[PDB]
Write a protein that binds this ligand. Structure first.
Ligand code: A8S
Lengths: 467, 467
């Protein structure tokens, strides 16, 4: 039993059952886990106001939501670090204490009366944990919040701040009540310390239109939230360097490529298709396993739906996955001197953008299907290799009983589209018939690529819904 | 001042200077760091006995070296976990306490009188930390070892076990002497507890032929030690499944490929070169950053030299990355029905193996040149793309401005060797002249391949000597 405004600490050794022990009631109940599953690119204020808009009811406007988020940030002592990104182990951001306080404010925006916390002071410095428990006690007492927390091991100053201590050991309960008399209770049984020591250490030793409006609003919200995530890969130094190196390589190798040498242009188009099939799919396959945990945690509270998250993710990724291929095509066309014309330029640009979107959708679907990031990446690589080997440029004599594979590979279709844009039906050129004219036309290839992209998105959505 | 046989600890907050504070004298001094930089594939016994062979002098026989290693293992309570791999965060192995005990025994093989321990107790379970401190105190008392350790925060039972306690704050010493008298001294100064609490928390609040023989023996033991790592560095399904799928789909794509269609076979050879140029290079680029820290720590003690470590690693890699290409060729040659003959089979197998070795050397050199794993991998990808684009199969009309790319690449040489093996000079075949005959001879290409295979490891060695 816990009274409102009382601070309870769940004490016990590792594996004693502290984690497992911890609709209107759930609405006012805020649960915080040990892991700080937060986006590392959003700053403090940005993240808390986003959670405020994504969790608070629609009867509250955006300006007052921002004001409430700012008040929560200032109440948790995050004013100094409000101008810094959250960060993670990879990219430097706020400290561990600030990150844990941001995680607390994530559930504090709903204004919960029953705050359950699993290991908040675990894994941080003595002073950071001391400040965290000071803040938690202040919220519990001054604001009258029913706070139940679990700590693997508290410090002395940390230990002396809980008004209630509940003791677990190997799944059973040993003591419940105030921390001050606890030793006395043990002194009732005959367990007295043999030396000056922290009483916490003894404890361990002894142990319809509205729905559409909400959908659109939260979809735009999640899209704006993931713009920050996409901005990293938009200007990733390694990615930009690789893209510009490939562009310069294509420009120099095919410098002022003529229309007479069909083989050189065919190889250039096939290489472009290979690059823009492998890179987007490989990039997209990593996101879904990486954000799976945070998506599950956020969906458990019911803050947002799966379809809105998926649409926001694809909308955010479209700009990142289209900015680079456009510049790559601009540089390559203006360096290697492919077929002149603004209309062919727009046609090939749209063709490659559609192919890149299809490859990104395939990568997202494969990442959704496989719960392991490395195995999903391996499957993506294998599928892309099987596709490129069936693109019509490496092998010209496909076995009769196997041809259906080249009818499902997107890189095939992209290569045929590129060849059609560069030379048409081969009337000017007229091996030519099989490598230029092809067996699949312009509009049918475009429709097949669009259908493949849409099907990949649908399959990814089905895989996400399966879990 | 610390006397032999006394358990001394250094206490203070993070950043107080505990880390910085902690030839015969250093030969008998064993230093252990916080990080357990150990190979995750060797079992508990295996790495211990190997460090014994690599550290103890040559006047100490192998059988009794193993006996001493077993005695040390049993002395540190590793008998139960001796049949389990050390492991890491990726692959499951021994527990944190067992791993730290293995790290202690790593320096305990040399039998050091002065054991320095830079934060070994930090970040483990209460019972594991208690066992570690009990083992350390037992060693310090019974064996008379001068132990100087550091702890970020000790438990009460842990804290009551040190004979000597040093106290640091912001780089300045505050208290020196026994832990028991620290409370009395601080009370005399005028600092007394306001509640029952652990005095450890109290402290924080205020705060020629012989050389060749040695080279050969240590090279051999290093190679044997690295064999365990090479056993599963890439044997995981992520790569063997990809290789077998590539073999199956390559054999099925060119199923009974004829000798008449030059383009198909040439594309197959080019794709094989592309597959075996980037895969070994990508595999090799990740081994060097990963092992950089452990190599630096192990070289700091002078246990082994740089050249022997390089030779052992290269021998392990050669034993590693030859079976997979051998199986690939063996499947592909018989599935696609290439030119008949055992001698051509051996020729192309040797060519592919040498090409794989050259790619491995390029990857190792690029990984050694760049101190960042991701940057080195990106540079490897860019360079391999540059070599692939200038292989003579994509762009037939290479401009004279950058044609020297084809004179420094590796995929080009492998492709020329493969075509000169499959079709020779083209007399049977006789676009043919440029794509079959070429301008680089078979023996010249083989010599260039071998020269670059040696020079890549030479570059890697010079890069290692630089840092
Ligand atoms: C883009 C990329 C990602 C990887 O993980 C493997 C590797 C580095 C080899 C690769 O360059 C793959 C290239 C492929 C499949 C084909 C090619 O290049 O013709």
């Amino acid at each position: 039993m816990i009274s409102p405004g009382e601070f309870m600490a769940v004490l016990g050794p590792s594996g004693s059952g502290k984690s497992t022990l911890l609709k209107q009631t759930l609405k006012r109940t805020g649960f915080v886990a040990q892991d700080d599953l937060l986006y590392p690119h959003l700053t403090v204020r940005e993240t808390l106001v986003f959670v405020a808009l994504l969790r608070l009811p629609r009867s509250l406007t955006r300006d007052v939501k921002l004001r409430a988020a700012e008040s929560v940030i200032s109440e948790l002592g995050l004013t100094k670090c409000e101008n810094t990104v959250v960060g993670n182990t990879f990219i430097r951001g706020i400290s561990g204490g600030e990150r844990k306080r941001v995680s607390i404010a994530h559930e504090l925006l709903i204004n919960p009366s029953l705050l359950v916390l699993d290991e908040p002071t675990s894994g941080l410095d003595a002073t950071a944990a001391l400040r965290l428990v000071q803040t938690l006690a202040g919220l519990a007492h001054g604001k009258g919040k029913t706070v139940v927390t679990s700590i693997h091991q508290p410090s002395s100053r940390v230990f002396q701040m809980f008004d209630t201590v509940l003791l677990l050991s190997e799944g059973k309960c040993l003591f419940v009540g105030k921390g001050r008399d606890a030793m006395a209770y043990f002194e009732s049984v005959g367990f007295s310390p043999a030396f000056p020591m922290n009483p916490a250490d003894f404890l361990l030793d002894l142990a319809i239109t509205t729905c559409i409006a909400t959908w659109f609003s939260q979809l735009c919200i999640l899209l704006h939230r993931l713009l920050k995530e996409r901005r990293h890969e938009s200007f990733d130094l390694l990615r930009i360097f690789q893209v510009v190196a490939a562009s310069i390589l294509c420009g120099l190798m095919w410098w002022h490529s003529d229309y007479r040498d069909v083989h050189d242009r065919l190889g250039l188009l096939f290489f472009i298709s290979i690059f823009w099939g492998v890179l987007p799919s490989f990039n997209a396959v990593f996101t879904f396993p990486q954000e799976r945990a945070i998506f599950t945690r956020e969906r458990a509270s019911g803050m947002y739906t799966l379809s809105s998250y998926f649409m926001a993710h694809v909308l955010g990724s479209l700009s990142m996955e289209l900015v680079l291929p456009a510049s790559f095509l601009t540089f390559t066309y203006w360096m290697v001197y492919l077929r002149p014309g603004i209309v062919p330029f727009l046609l090939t640009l749209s063709v490659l953008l559609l192919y890149v979107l299809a490859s990104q959708g395939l990568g997202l679907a494969l990442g959704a299907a496989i719960m392991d990031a490395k195995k999903a990446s391996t499957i993506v690589t294998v599928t892309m290799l099987a596709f490129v080997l069936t693109g019509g440029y490496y092998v010209n004599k496909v076995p009769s009983g196997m041809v259906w594979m080249k009818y499902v590979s997107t890189t095939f279709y992209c290569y045929r589209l590129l060849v059609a844009i560069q030379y048409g039906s081969g009337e000017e050129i007229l091996f030519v018939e099989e490598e230029v004219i092809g067996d699949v036309g312009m509009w049918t290839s475009v429709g097949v690529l669009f259908l493949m992209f849409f099907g990949y998105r649908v399959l990814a959505y089905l895989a996400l819904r399966r879990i």
